[PDB]
Design a protein around this ligand. Structure first.
Ligand SMILES: [Zn+2]
Ligand SMILES: [Zn+2]
Ligand SMILES: [Zn+2]
Ligand SMILES: [Zn+2]
Ligand SMILES: [Zn+2]
Ligand SMILES: [Zn+2]
Ligand SMILES: [Zn+2]
Ligand SMILES: [Zn+2]
Ligand SMILES: [Zn+2]
Ligand SMILES: [Zn+2]
Ligand SMILES: [Zn+2]
Ligand SMILES: [Zn+2]
Ligand SMILES: [Zn+2]
Lengths: 460, 57
């Protein structure tokens, strides 16, 4: 019964492994034959292994005592010259921005010969479930939100005259029928229509494009293949007959405006561009009409300890000259990602230390303390792991966000600690996200190691 | 909203002990407090026309 089947399976496995071992042994014998042929191609120089000299330098001699019945040979010790050591450290992955750490199946492809009609969930579900509108990426690492979407789930003039080929407007009595069927969707087409076969992909693309262009016919025919405007009207008619600063989380509540019922109002944050509220929202942040440099402590941005939103602060300098050097507004350096060069060397205090290549004036951007974004419990776990060897790099960014740069960070991770720091760090909300920037407390000199007070962070 | 009554107290911050603070009003040029006073209104650096809600004034 079961025992017999198990025994048969065991015998089959034994035969298979025996055959595999025999084949591997044959291959290994062939490879060792060619290897030994290569080895015997050339001999080696005679290594007589002479016993050096007899106290050439007059130093101590080695007392190699043979525990058997043999005399104790004596050989002077040939000491080896010393080599400079290097402070201990672990490997890490270079990184510039942040990186958060997590803690009937589908419609067919229009690409390829195989195609059909998709209308159960419209025709656009592959490119809609995965979206990161903040920085326009597909399945972004920066914003791994709840992601409710899952499992891959206007006035214009009439097109008068038959533009190019025959148009649907040029048809005798079709525009009034079109007006009628859009009115009901809130002489006429009496001529019989044509009968032309339409592929599934073509039909799906036509439906998707008609879902947006609507009454437009010339352009929707131009983008499509063939797709006669008269035929387009034919399918349109047929279809009707057939049928304590937190992250700036965007708001899309249609029940009521942003007033005591909005996450942004709850989070006391300005409704940025990604918010789906009205353009005249109360929480909307007025931009800067600043002349330059946006460093007047007054600037509502500076008063709110905030960056300059490119879509709101327009003349301030947060939008003009994107692909260039540092902009006129000094409250945009961290958004552009431009920082100061840093170096690595053995610290004069302990371990490694970061020495800046160029002098930094008072309150001037130096670097960004990026790394891996982890949760508070994940921050505790990572900090314990790092402190197991007595070296922690955990830093506080937001109320529930912690930046760690042990396994992944930048050169600014090795910041020295001193009672008279030469640098200081402040948190600024950049484009709806929180970042940590490095600033010089005084006019630091060239090449001096940067000092950072650890009392500001959770771990001092 | 009350008119900005000047306060004269050198080497003394205006915080919970100043009439300007009690009136929720900014210290103006006529105030004789320290030039780095907490309630001092920063001059808005508008490019022009100061008519957008953008300017704190
Ligand atoms: Zn993203
Ligand atoms: Zn809202
Ligand atoms: Zn909002
Ligand atoms: Zn809003
Ligand atoms: Zn400004
Ligand atoms: Zn600015
Ligand atoms: Zn601004
Ligand atoms: Zn006062
Ligand atoms: Zn004052
Ligand atoms: Zn005053
Ligand atoms: Zn003003
Ligand atoms: Zn003005
Ligand atoms: Zn103004």
């Amino acid at each position: 019964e079961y025992m017999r089947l198990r025994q048969l399976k065991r015998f089959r496995r034994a035969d298979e492994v025996k055959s595999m071992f025999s084949s591997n042994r044959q291959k290994i014998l062939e490879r060792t034959e060619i290897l030994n042929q290569e080895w015997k191609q050339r001999r080696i120089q005679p290594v007589h292994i002479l016993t050096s000299v007899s106290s050439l330098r007059g130093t101590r001699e080695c007392s190699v005592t043979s525990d058997l019945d043999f005399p104790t040979q004596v050989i002077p010790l040939k000491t080896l010259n010393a080599v400079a050591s290097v402070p201990i450290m672990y490997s890490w992955s270079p990184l510039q921005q942040n990186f958060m750490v997590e803690d009937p199946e589908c419609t067919p492809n229009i690409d390829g010969p195989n195609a059909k009609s998709v209308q159960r969930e419209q025709s656009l579900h592959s490119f809609h479930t995965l979206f990161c509108r903040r920085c326009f990426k597909y399945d972004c690492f920066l914003h791994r939100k709840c992601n409710y979407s899952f499992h891959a789930t206007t006035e214009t003039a009439l097109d008068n005259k038959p533009c190019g080929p025959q148009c649907y407007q040029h048809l005798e009595g079709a525009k009034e029928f079109a007006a009628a069927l859009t009115a009901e969707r809130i002489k006429p087409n009496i001529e019989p229509p044509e009968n032309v076969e339409w592929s599934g992909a073509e039909a799906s693309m036509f439906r998707v494009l008609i879902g947006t262009y609507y009454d437009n016919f010339c352009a929707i025919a131009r983008l499509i293949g063939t797709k006669t405007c008269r035929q387009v009207y034919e399918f349109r008619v047929k279809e009707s007959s057939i049928i304590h600063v937190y992250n700036y989380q965007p708001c899309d509540h249609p029940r009521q405006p942003c007033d005591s019922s909005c996450p942004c109002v709850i989070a006391q944050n300005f409704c940025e561009k990604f918010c789906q509220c009205s353009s005249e929202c109360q929480n909307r942040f007025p931009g800067c009409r600043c002349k330059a440099q946006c460093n007047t402590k007054q600037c509502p941005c500076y008063l709110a300890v905030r960056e300059c939103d490119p879509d709101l602060c327009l003349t301030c300098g947060a939008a003009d000259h994107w692909d260039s050097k540092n902009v006129s507004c000094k409250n945009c350096s961290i958004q552009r990602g431009s920082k100061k060069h840093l170096l690595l060397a053995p610290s004069d205090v302990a371990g490694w230390g970061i020495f800046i290549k160029d002098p930094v004036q008072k309150n001037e951007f130096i670097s960004e303390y990026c790394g891996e974004i982890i949760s508070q419990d994940e921050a505790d776990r990572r900090g314990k792991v790092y402190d197991k060897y007595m070296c922690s790099f955990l830093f506080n960014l937001n109320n529930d966000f912690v930046v760690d740069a042990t396994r992944k960070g930048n050169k600014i991770r090795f910041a020295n600690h001193s009672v008279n720091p030469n640098c200081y760090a402040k948190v600024m909300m950049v484009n709806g996200d929180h970042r940590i920037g490095i600033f010089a407390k005084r006019a630091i000199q060239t090449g001096e190691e940067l000092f950072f007070d650890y009392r500001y962070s959770q771990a001092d």
